[PDB]
Amino acid sequence: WITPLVIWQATTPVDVKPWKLSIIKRCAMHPGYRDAPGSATLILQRFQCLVGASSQITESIITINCNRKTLKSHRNLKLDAHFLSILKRILSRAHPANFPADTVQNTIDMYLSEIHQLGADDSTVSLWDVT
Amino acid sequence: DNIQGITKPAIRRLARRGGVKRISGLIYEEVRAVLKSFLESVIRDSVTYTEHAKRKTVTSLDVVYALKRQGRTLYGFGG
Amino acid sequence: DNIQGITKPAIRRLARRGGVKRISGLIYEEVRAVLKSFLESVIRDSVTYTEHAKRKTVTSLDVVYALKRQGRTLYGFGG
Amino acid sequence: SKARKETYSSYIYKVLKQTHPDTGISQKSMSILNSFVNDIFERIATEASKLAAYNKKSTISAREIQTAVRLILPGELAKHAVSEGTRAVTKYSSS
Amino acid sequence: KARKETYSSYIYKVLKQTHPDTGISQKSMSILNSFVNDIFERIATEASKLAAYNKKSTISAREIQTAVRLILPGELAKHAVSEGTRAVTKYSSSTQA
Amino acid sequence: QSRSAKAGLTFPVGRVHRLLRRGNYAQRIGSGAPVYLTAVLEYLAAEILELAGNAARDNKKTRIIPRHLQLAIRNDDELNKLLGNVTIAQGGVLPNI
Amino acid sequence: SQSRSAKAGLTFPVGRVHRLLRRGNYAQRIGSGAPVYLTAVLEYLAAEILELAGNAARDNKKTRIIPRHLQLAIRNDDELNKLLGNVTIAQGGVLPNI
Amino acid sequence: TPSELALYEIRKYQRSTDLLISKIPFARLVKEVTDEFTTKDQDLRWQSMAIMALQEASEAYLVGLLEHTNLLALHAKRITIMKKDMQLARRIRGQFI
Amino acid sequence: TPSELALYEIRKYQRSTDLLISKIPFARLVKEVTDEFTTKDQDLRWQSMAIMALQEASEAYLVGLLEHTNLLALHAKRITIMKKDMQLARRIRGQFI
């Protein structure tokens, strides 16, 4: 359950840290998990799209790859529709003109779609360049 | 929600009708996406016709008119 | 024959403007055949247009309208 | 109470019975045939109108209709169509 | 000395407002004329078809607006309908005043 | 005695005449155009009905179905190319062999 | 008396469009507000395409607009490529691709 | 053998002519899509025969696309239709794209 | 290296805009084709701008077909466009067939 989470908050090459890569890869390489190789593959794939080519991350995935039917099931994240339907109504009622129900469902969907995409895939700023 | 509601045995039947014997995993949501695109393309013009007609219901005449405008003529529904 | 007059370098030039790198030896005859078929269709349409027009000379207007009949509209001519 | 539906149903049924009486028609097939006939008529009429408007021809006549049907229908059916149409028009003029 | 209707000087003036100087070839001018004639024909045919569908003998601003919304992709269609609405409202207001 | 009765065409003639007049296709309509168009329509309808009937004969069933209509239309290669863009409701698809 | 083209502030003509619609045999009756709307939308489209062609020529730093420039602009702009997918341009060439 | 059962059901779906997608879910799908396109002032209304028409056109298009993907698969020496093959079919036919 | 010269001339034909087929042979080809369609009582007459128009449309179609064949070649893991690839492109686009 935290595996889909870790995919989300880390969106930058900086968050793709080799010490984090070692922990994620070792868990998949660890025998007594039964779910880390499925969990690590998406996290490694998510870290791949962040830093770029990352030839070091594709050699780890091919070592921990599975039959990928479960990975297809692991790519899909099953969130309860009843849980989200009530949540959309609750958010709109508490805060009018805030957290719209259409976007709340949409925001969850694109977070879910990010997991599905893993299988397929004073600081100075010049006013001159501001557009 | 209901995009996954279109269940994979239906896509299996579509593939068998097409004539294939082997199925991958990506084609499922690829079919879902192409169906969504085709549906939105037809629905936009159907709603345009309905709103211009000042009626607030959608009819077979309107949908076949939209299909003929797209170029995929449909027969057997009148008009 | 002037259908054979279409030279192999011309077909190589065409396939490369398409964007190919290597061309097999069987492509030239098929290119000639498809050009012949397209020409046959366009000429038949232009000829029947000018036969209705009871004129012994075809016109760029008639060629443009044969093209519009085929669905491939051509710009820069007529009007 | 309902404005009558303008169809070709009686004439299509009569044509079928002239051909052979044993079989019948289903409603879906009837709608399909009606739509096909309407589409063909619309195509031919639009073509004749466009062709007449091109030669600044104010009227539509047998020559224009024959040219339009030659344009639309492919030649194999067009030969029989124009032959039968010319026969019909000449015999109507004789009558 | 018979004038033939063609949107040549008008497109030339539109380009004049667009840029202080910009040359166009005769082929380019013919292409522009063909394009504008094609678009006008498409919109007129769509409006007439809508009127025939709705059993209306006349077409109007709403008819043409719906027609152009159908022909153009929605992104350009909203720009086009804004064009038409503000043009027609300012034209009608000028006549009243 | 109706004009259709003289013409020998099952499809009516004055019907097509009034349809042509209503559709404002041309400013002035002719007189041989309705009979010619009616004759062409009758020929096409008879042809398609006869081919569908022959398909039914091969189908050994007294009831003809859009299934059989699709059989006839798609089996005749010329008719298939003429009607490539149309889709028959509940028509199914052709077997590979 | 000024023309209603000047009333509408449109360089493109309204009287010519009205006459074409009347003699085009499209509908039995032509609306009063139809020609101004049609002229406005036609002028907007023409102005947009002319602006794109001028930008392409400026990028190509020649003062002359050519069918090559027109084809380049049309194929580069998605909103215009959608509307002109099938039509071909004489002496337009092919957009350079990698 | 799996091939025997597979080919048997290929036979039955080659001479089958029924809808394959569930009616209530498909109706809900088009329902919610057309509500998504709508302003908040109203809600649209739909009819059953329109639902059948849209579904029929949808599966005509889908069967065409899937058979073309099968043909691409035969071209690529693979009996499996895959992501790149479907992408290629969508691109090449290039409708509303 | 052959690839260097090949890519250089690919560059020049990517920014080339001239006709590639000989004008007199192409004119003779269309000449004799349209005489082939003709009855023996007359001979047709043709014009140069019509010849350019037909040639321009012809090579638009040809370039489209050839680039699609190149895309099929990339699909089939072969840099060579071959007979089956061209057959497949012709079938899939399926114009006047």
Author numbering:
A (entry chain II): 148 to 268, 285 to 294
B (entry chain f), C (entry chain b): 25 to 103
D (entry chain d): 34 to 128
E (entry chain h): 35 to 131
F (entry chain c): 17 to 113
G (entry chain g): 16 to 113
H (entry chain e), I (entry chain a): 133 to 229
Share the article's original sentences.
We determined the cryo–electron microscopy structure of the yeast inner kinetochore assembled onto the centromere-specific centromere protein A nucleosomes (CENP-ANuc). In the inner kinetochore complex, CENP-ANuc is wrapped by only one turn of DNA (~90 bp), in a left-handed configuration. CBF3Core interacts with CCANTopo and CCANNon-topo mainly through their CENP-I subunits. In the inner kinetochore complex, CBF3Core adopts the same architecture as seen for free CBF3Core, except that the Gal4-DNA binding domain of the CEP3A subunit shifts position to interact with the essential CCG motif of CDEIII, similar to the complex of CBF3Core with CEN3-CENP-ANuc. This assembly comprises two copies of all CCAN and histone subunits and of the Cep3 subunit of CBF3Core, a stoichiometry that is in agreement with in vivo fluorescence microscopy–based assessments of the relative proportions of yeast inner kinetochore subunits, which are mainly found at approximately two to three copies per kinetochore.
The point centromere of budding yeast specifies assembly of the large kinetochore complex to mediate chromatid segregation. Kinetochores comprise the centromere-associated inner kinetochore (CCAN) complex and the microtubule-binding outer kinetochore KNL1-MIS12-NDC80 (KMN) network. The inner kinetochore centromere-associated inner kinetochore (CCAN) complex (14 to 16 subunits) associates with the centromere, generally through specific recognition of CENP-ANuc.
